[PDB]
Amino acid sequence: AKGVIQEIIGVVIRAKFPEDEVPEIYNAIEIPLGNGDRLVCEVQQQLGNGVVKAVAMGSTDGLRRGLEVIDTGRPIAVPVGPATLGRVFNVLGDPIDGMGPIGPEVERRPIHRDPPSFEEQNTQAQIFETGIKVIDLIAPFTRGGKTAIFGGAGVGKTVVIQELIANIAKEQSGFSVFAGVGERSREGNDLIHEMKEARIDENTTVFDKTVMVFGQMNEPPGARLRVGLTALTMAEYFRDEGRDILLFIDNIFRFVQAGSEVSSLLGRMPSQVGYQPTLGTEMGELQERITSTKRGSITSMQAVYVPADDYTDPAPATVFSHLDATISLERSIAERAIFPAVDPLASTSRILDPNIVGEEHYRVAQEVKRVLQRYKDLKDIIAILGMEELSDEDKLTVQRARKIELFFSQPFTVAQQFTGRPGKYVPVKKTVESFARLLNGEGDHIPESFFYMQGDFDDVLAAYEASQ
Amino acid sequence: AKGVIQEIIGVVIRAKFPEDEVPEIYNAIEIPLGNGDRLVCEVQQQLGNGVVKAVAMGSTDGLRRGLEVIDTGRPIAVPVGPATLGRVFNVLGDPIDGMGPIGPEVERRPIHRDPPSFEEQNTQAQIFETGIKVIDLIAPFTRGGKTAIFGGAGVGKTVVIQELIANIAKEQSGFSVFAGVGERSREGNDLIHEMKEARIDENTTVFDKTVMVFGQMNEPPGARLRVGLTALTMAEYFRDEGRDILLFIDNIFRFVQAGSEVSSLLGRMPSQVGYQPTLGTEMGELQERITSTKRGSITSMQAVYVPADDYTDPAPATVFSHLDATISLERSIAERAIFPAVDPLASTSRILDPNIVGEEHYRVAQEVKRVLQRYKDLKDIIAILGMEELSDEDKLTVQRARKIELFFSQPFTVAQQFTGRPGKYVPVKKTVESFARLLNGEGDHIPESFFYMQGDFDDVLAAYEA
Amino acid sequence: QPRQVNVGTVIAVGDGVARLSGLDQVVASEIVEFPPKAGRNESIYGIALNLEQDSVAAIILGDDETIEEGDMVTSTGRVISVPVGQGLLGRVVNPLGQPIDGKGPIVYEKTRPIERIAPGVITRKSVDTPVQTGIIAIDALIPIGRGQRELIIGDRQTGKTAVAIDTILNQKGQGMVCIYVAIGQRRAQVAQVVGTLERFGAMEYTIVVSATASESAALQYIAPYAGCAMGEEIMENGVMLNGQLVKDALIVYDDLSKHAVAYRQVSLLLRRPPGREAYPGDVFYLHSRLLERAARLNEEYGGGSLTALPVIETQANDVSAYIPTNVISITDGQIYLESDLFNAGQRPALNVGISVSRVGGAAQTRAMRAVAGKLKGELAQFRDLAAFAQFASDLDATTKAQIERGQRLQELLKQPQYQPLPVEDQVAVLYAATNNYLDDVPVPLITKWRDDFLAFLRTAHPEVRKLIYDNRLDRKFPTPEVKEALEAAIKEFKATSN
Amino acid sequence: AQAEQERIRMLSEAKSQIADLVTLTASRVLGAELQARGHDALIAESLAAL
Amino acid sequence: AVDASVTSAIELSAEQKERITRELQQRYGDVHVTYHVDPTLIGGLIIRVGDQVLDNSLRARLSAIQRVL
Ligand SMILES: Nc1ncnc2c1ncn2[C@@H]1O[C@H](COP(=O)(O)OP(=O)(O)OP(=O)(O)O)[C@@H](O)[C@H]1O
Ligand SMILES: [Mg+2]
């Protein structure tokens, strides 16, 4: 304990400790910083004669060299238990809501814990109904399994996440944890607060069953780097005692970007496009903790931001192998005013198996993909020549594909703020029936424009009758 | 002349020698292992004071930081001579076959040698007599030249190599050397050793007339880098003896890749796409030894693998800068029962000009490959028209093109014991005369399946009359 | 039994890489121990990779959060090695041989060192014995033989692991000891694979070596050489399987792109100079060392074999990348799986146009070789004529029938999951299809036709299946004897149904 | 066959517990002796054997 | 000089500390011997001099574990 700061490079602080009291790899050291409030750094490396390199996870832009640092001797500890329910925390576990601090009697758990072993893994999963046609048909939201949506900058990842929460957080049958590792403090939070506090479950709000840890974009790289681990530690307590947990981590890519900035400041050799050499290991350490085990189940739902529109970027490429259900949002689909913007061809799921989701559901999904696969094959032919050169069956499949593409669009109850269309909740059975009817041939006479932003097939038929 | 190892980073070993006994730039190191044998490293860089940086040529999974090193004074010395004939060697020249070690009485020559001077280079290109009709007609070799093969497996590239070895061993002395540079151990070995030991010519196996040096992909980058130079040393001995030599380098692109890995491990900055800065010079130090002097010639028939299909890649570009002809074996021709799958098109040569082969040879080689210049583009009109029930001249040109395509096949003396047909050796004069007569029209009035598998046009006539 | 061992001190521990200061007379790939201390009651091993002067940079095979500066490291004289032998069959072991399935300690007596030279240059033999994948497309068009390393390359999610698992399941009684090496694969997915293997009883001859993503990059780096050493021991000494000494091994590297990523991580953390795409210079050497150890030794050296199936994911189907091109160069064959074919209903999703097997017909049974030549020719010509099929509607009856036949074959290759077809069944189906017995069957019902035909042979005529399997090795498979009682069975099935 | 494998794997687990138990009780026979009687000078000489 | 280190569970007499010191002074010279107790290690013939260490008191117990397993 009682070291001194040697260098302050960005948010990376190199401190010198006595020879026999060097902090451990992941210990949390503190600068008094004056004013009675301290800056909690996390060690990352040990460089030699008592010299350690720590990540500030704070402003670290008003402190000098030679400042003393106090070694706590333990990694970052965050409160866990029912006391964390309905509260908002930092990466450090310090509450930021108007309510008081967590009492000392509440257990503090280190945010760096080993992921569940191979024995503890629970492979049992089943479809989690969500009411979104494209999600519940092509890439079923998996209960007890990791799933994530990959979108660019203009697509509505946040809208989809908010609608999903509105649909499924009321009938939770358990607590939930939200972690915006990297997201706008406007819509990622302080507006999800209003939505969650407005929703009421038998005189108890949804927010009364939720633990929320942000580390918003504004925060320095350390907070965005470790906020995911804080949320995971807060949710593992509830998973370990059997409670079903809904976990919503927003923009894992921001966690990766924070890791990249920290690594760049740490002097590590860059890999690929400026990313950290330890990208795969960091992703493994975070993601392998998001697992439903034999003691409890975590129904994770993540979001991933692709830089520019590159799906070959190392961060989404690393995420892709850590998921059960993959949802891909495309810029072109969104620019075609299809707000869900999900690409069925590039979106898959593990539980899209007839033994799990249902034989009819599986057949319908496979046909809805074989169509639009024919369409992707004939895209160039249509673009340069036109519909006429195709054969009759090819033509029919093409307009069926366009009708399906239009029909995947669905109004969202959270889209009322900029769209006047009321939201719709289409059950998975209704979605399967509607798409089976559409593929049978029913609805062929209906023009494609009638499938835009509708509910089930009955709503499309009713609109067609209204317009005669 | 004894030093100590300082650093061991992968297959790069840094050894410190006494100040006045530093090894030369390309000398060997021969780190002695505990269990009797030695690890032959090759110096690459003299640096500092008495310190040399050397490439392993071996595993280096059992070396400490104090092992002594025994400088040899000379570069990697490899056995050369008639003793090293019909045997398989590694990069160091140690025979890896089951037979016994090479006796000390055999002369050992340094692996690194200067290419022949400009004064000794032939002032006129000379065609190399291979005997294969399609090879000696469209894409003739060059005495002391280079030739590339672009074809996968199952197209008979190994059989073509065997036929070339047999022809050079029969018509001339034709001692052959095969260099396995970074090739698959399954394809390069036990499907070349067996297919050449089983293959025979005048009760003498092809393997008995060929020297094989094998540095496979499993070997460290230095081994794949210097295996080519080992093969060149073995071939250069016989060239100095005055005998024409056919040298095969399998996957010279793997030699380039080995050079790139050696440079990356040696601390050199990358050039272009990660390749070594000394790419052109490294290619020159090897390909320039493949040349035809006055006393003898080393003709080379290399195989080139392009990563993906990128010919803009620096390795294929540097390889092609040192090529005189290309042969493109084709899957479609191979699967049409025509065993020599040399595509009449996409098989060029810089010898195919009137001032070397002759006016008649160029004329006949231009009349052919002209009816095929379209790749018989008439196939599409037949496909969508039913030949239109009449094509006038096009029927004659299609018949002639099919006849020539069938006629390009030639019996293999190495496959005589497999297909049960004697092999015919066709000189270049016979090729040009036969194709001249076929284009004149003597091949007409004769149906197909009579030009399928024969040596000369005279043989086709004899088959027709019988 | 007092012993004196050289020790050094950890002077700098970082992201799983430690500098060990003075460890004189350390072998270039030792296993430094990091003995237990206060707070750590176990040992954390590491590999001493860089033997620099006055410093030994050693990666760590485990959690580096416990290693602290100033700790002692005892240089165990043994180069990195893994337990091997009979005791590993049916166990999930991390690349160090320590069981992770919690079914008890691993019983063993021999520890074959990983990172060994290739089996030999002349010690190998021509690949002749086929590896029955159980997938019609692979077994007919892209054959895999014992001792041939066949790459499974595709997009992120196309069926690569599914194909590998189907191959592993199919080797029930074929005298093979499958090995599944999971590199960088999430622990839940490895649990799913183990559950699938146990469900079909395929964990009585399979060794699963898993180095999941959370585990240190060194474990993923040595993940494929573990397992490869296990297969080497199987092919050199054999393991008692079903009362028969099996000396054939089949190893599946679950993803070599993740292994290359792990090697890049450990190299960059060691501050070695990068190369192309930030990968270290000798990544081709890496994978060549790994893959050239898969060979079919001759009868003099044991006659064993080790079949490797590297798996590679390609970003946006970019085959011309660095690692995909390297491993394509290394392997003897490629199996391309496309998302476009996978979505279009072609479940195995093989791109037979560009998938190649350099071994060729030598890795097929004589029945399969005699029947699949027409298959390959007709499929290739159908692929060629697809250009006219897409647009032209005025093509003659010959071209229409030929496109129809191509569609028949393509629908024949549409195999479901976890339903491998034995060699006799595939031979029978392909003989029925290539001999015009299937022409009158409409395309949408061909898969149902094949399933019903297999039920027919399994129930009505087991003797024809026994006859086909008995004489599948003769030079001329279509003997009138095998020719009858098979065309008769097809005719009976055609007459009875539809 | 699985039942036989289950039986034999429990024997190894039982043997492993015996090996773990005997060493823990080996701390009773001599490690507990180190409280009062185990303090020895000839053992210190054994360190200085080399 | 050479930094040596020896550890033992028993806290021998201060004279015993000197006895440890001068039995090592015969080799090399004024070695800076560092003393610990290691309560978790109930034994151990810990003699660490330079980069070499000698140890077997409880390692024999661990060796007995290796034999029985
Ligand atoms: N008949 C089939 N053959 C192959 N794959 C199938 C078949 N039927 C369905 N599939 C799909 O293949 C999946 C199996 O995983 P797959 O082999 O595609 O993974 P992968 O290529 O290793 O990808 P990942 O990057 O997710 O690990 C199933 O979940 C299903 O989506
Ligand atoms: Mg997989």
How far, in Å, from the CA of A300 to the mean position of ligand 1?
A: 21
Token pair recorded at residue C402: 């030929």
Q: For ligand 1, which residues put their CB under 6 angstroms from it?
A: A 320-321, 348, 350; C 156-162, 313, 347-348, 416-417
Alpha carbon distance B235, B436 (integer Å): 37
Closest CA to B306 of B298, B297, B316: B316
Cα Rg of chain C (Å, integer): 25
Give the CA dihedral C74, C76, C77, C81, nearest 10 degrees. Answer: -150
**Burial of B202 (C-beta count, 10 Å sphere; 0-12/13-18/19+):** exposed
Alpha carbon distance B431, B364 (integer Å): 9
Alpha carbon distance A78, A76 (integer Å): 7
- Residue nearest ligand 1's atom 11 by CA: C159
- The answer to whether C72 contacts E63, with C-beta atoms less than 8 Å apart, is no
C contacts of D9 (beta carbons < 8 Å): 103-104
Closest CA to B212 of B318, B136, B99: B99
Residue in D closest to C242 by C-alpha: D1
Residue C276 among the catalytic residues: no
CA end-to-end span of chain C, whole Å? 82
Helix, strand, coil percentages (3-state) for chain E, rounded to 5, are 30, 20, 50
Residue B68 CA, chain-centre distance (Å), reads 39
The residue from B87, B157, B369, B400 that is catalytic is B157
Looking up tokens 């004074």 gives B73
Alpha carbon distance C126, C122 (integer Å): 11
Contact of chains A and C by CB distance (3 or more pairs under 8 angstroms): yes
A contacts of C277 (beta carbons < 8 Å): 272
| Helix (H/G/I), strand (E/B), else coil: A404 | helix
- Resolution of the structure in the document, Å: 2.9
Task: Classify strands C92-93 and C12-13 as parallel, antiparallel or unpaired.
Answer: unpaired
Looking up tokens 């400041």 gives A265
Closest CA to A413 of A163, A193, A222: A163
Method: cryo-EM
Of the residues C67, C68, C158, C187, the best mutation for testing chain A's interface (the one with the most A CB atoms within 10 Å of its CB) is C187
Task: Classify strands B68-70 and B2-9 as parallel, antiparallel or unpaired.
Answer: antiparallel
Alpha carbon distance A313, A307 (integer Å): 7
Closest CA to A64 of A39, A43, A42: A39
Q: Is C25 on the interface with E (CB under 8 A)?
A: no
Closest CA to B30 of B18, B13, B47, B46: B13
**Burial of A400 (C-beta count, 10 Å sphere; 0-12/13-18/19+):** buried
Amino acid identity, position A367: E
- The answer to whether E10 contacts D34, with C-beta atoms less than 8 Å apart, is yes
Closest CA to A178 of A95, A96, A249, A86: A249
Indicate if the alpha-carbon torsion angle A31, A32, A33, A38 is positive or negative.
positive
Alpha carbon distance A101, A94 (integer Å): 7
- The answer to whether E40 contacts C8, with C-beta atoms less than 8 Å apart, is no
Closest CA to A323 of A302, A305, A307, A341: A302
Alpha carbon distance A217, A235 (integer Å): 22
Contact A334, A156 (CB under 8 A): yes
Closest CA to C156 of A276, A323, A272: A323
Residue B184 among the catalytic residues: yes
Closest CA to C432 of C496, C385, C380, C488: C488
How far, in Å, from the CA of C162 to the mean position of ligand 1?
A: 5
CA distances from B410 to B127, B329, B331, B342, B429 (A): 20, 15, 17, 11, 16
User: Which letter, b or e, does each residue of C184-218 get, where b requires 16 or more Cβ atoms within 10 Å of its Cβ?
Assistant: bbbbbbbbbbbebbeebebbbbbbbbbbbbbbbbb
Task: Classify strands C92-93 and C17-19 as parallel, antiparallel or unpaired.
Answer: unpaired
How far, in Å, from the CA of A126 to the mean position of ligand 1?
A: 17
Alpha carbon distance B270, B260 (integer Å): 8
Looking up tokens 């020790």 gives C7
Closest CA to A207 of A183, A189, A182, A230: A189
Contact C319, C325 (CB under 8 A): yes
- B60 φ, ψ to 5°? 55, 50
The widest CA-to-CA distance across chain E, in whole angstroms, is 44
Contact C430, C371 (CB under 8 A): yes
Looking up tokens 């004064």 gives B119
How far, in Å, from the CA of C196 to the mean position of ligand 2?
A: 13
Closest CA to C251 of C230, C236, C220, C221: C230
Alpha carbon distance B237, B264 (integer Å): 33
Give the ligand 1 atom nearest the CA of A323.
26
Identify the helix (H) or strand (E) that includes residue A318. helix A314-320
In a 13 Å sphere around the CA of B327, the CA atoms on its Cβ side amount to 29
C92-93 β-sheet, strand order: C92-93, C207-211, C177-183, C248-253, C305-308
Alpha carbon distance B452, B444 (integer Å): 14
